[PDB]
């Protein structure tokens, strides 16, 4: 509702992402480290210095346990899994028990196929056959901290978030839902929140100067949408 999430993939330099955090100033930042060449953990240190109270999330490659450890040392609070967690749900349960359920994020890239919601793995390239309904229920029971609802059909459209998928997922989970895909203008953000999303992620709209970060924050304020906190300005 009132949280902004920035997505920095391996294709963007860590220095660039840090500069964006200064101007935009989001609440949550997701950075990819599966390609060490980009100095992912180095950027994580930069985010902490600018705002040590930020929620940093790190995406690790399947099988890099020590990589997850380093990301935590950098000040990360949460870490993400996708195809690995789906193939072996036991990993999600173990991760919650060890570092706290709130630190494990289960990401699901989904599409509408055969008249039912179906999960896709491998960056949404290949269908698994697992139903979106059944997977979401399992993720909650496993102790997943949060769930990332990604719409592959809407990704890159920039014509509004997949409000259909958002509403459909909401009744099956009591976790925070991070909606990703379709974000092109301020109107799309407001729609996604009404659909029951807890936070909205956007990367393209910022890098290409499509939406103004500061004006976006003002928009949410005007509608009376904010988290339970105390405001003090002079």
UniProtKB/Swiss-Prot annotation:
The active site is at 109. One of its GO terms (cellular component) is cytoplasm. Its main location: cytoplasm. One of its GO terms (biological process) is L-histidine biosynthetic process. Changing residue 162 to N: No change in activity. Changing residue 82 to A: No change in activity. GO terms for molecular function: imidazoleglycerol-phosphate synthase activity; lyase activity. Keywords: Amino-acid biosynthesis, Cytoplasm, Histidine biosynthesis, Lyase. It catalyses: 5-[(5-phospho-1-deoxy-D-ribulos-1-ylimino)methylamino]-1-(5-phospho-beta-D-ribosyl)imidazole-4-carboxamide + L-glutamine = D-erythro-1-(imidazol-4-yl)glycerol 3-phosphate + 5-amino-1-(5-phospho-beta-D-ribosyl)imidazole-4-carboxamide + L-glutamate + H(+). Its EC number is 4.3.2.10. Belongs to the HisA/HisF family. Heterodimer of HisH and HisF. This is Imidazole glycerol phosphate synthase subunit HisF.
């Amino acid at each position: 509702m009132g949280k902004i999430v920035l997505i920095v993939d391996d294709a963007t330099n860590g220095r660039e992402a840090v500069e964006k955090y200064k101007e935009l100033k989001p609440d949550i930042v997701t950075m990819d480290i599966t390609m060490p060449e980009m100095n992912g953990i180095d950027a994580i240190k930069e985010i902490m210095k600018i705002d040590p109270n930020a929620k940093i999330i790190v995406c690790s490659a399947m099988g890099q346990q020590a990589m997850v450890i380093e990301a935590i040392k950098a000040g990360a609070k949460g870490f993400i899994v996708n195809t690995a967690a789906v193939e072996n749900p036991s990993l999600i349960t173990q991760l919650a028990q060890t570092f706290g359920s709130q630190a494990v994020v289960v990401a699901i890239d989904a599409k509408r196929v055969d008249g039912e919601f179906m999960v896709f793995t491998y960056s949404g390239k290949k269908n698994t056959g697992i139903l979106l309904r059944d997977w979401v229920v399992e993720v909650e029971k496993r102790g997943a901290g949060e769930i990332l609802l990604t719409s592959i059909d809407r990704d890159g459209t920039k014509s509004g978030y997949d409000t259909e998928m958002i509403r459909f997922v909401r009744p099956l989970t009591t976790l925070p839902i991070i909606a990703s895909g379709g974000a092109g203008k301020m109107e799309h953000f407001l729609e996604a929140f009404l659909a029951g999303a807890d936070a909205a992620a956007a990367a393209s709209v910022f890098h290409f100067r499509e939406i103004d970060g500061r004006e976006l924050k003002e928009y949410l304020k005007k509608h009376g949408v904010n988290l339970e906190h105390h405001h003090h300005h002079h």
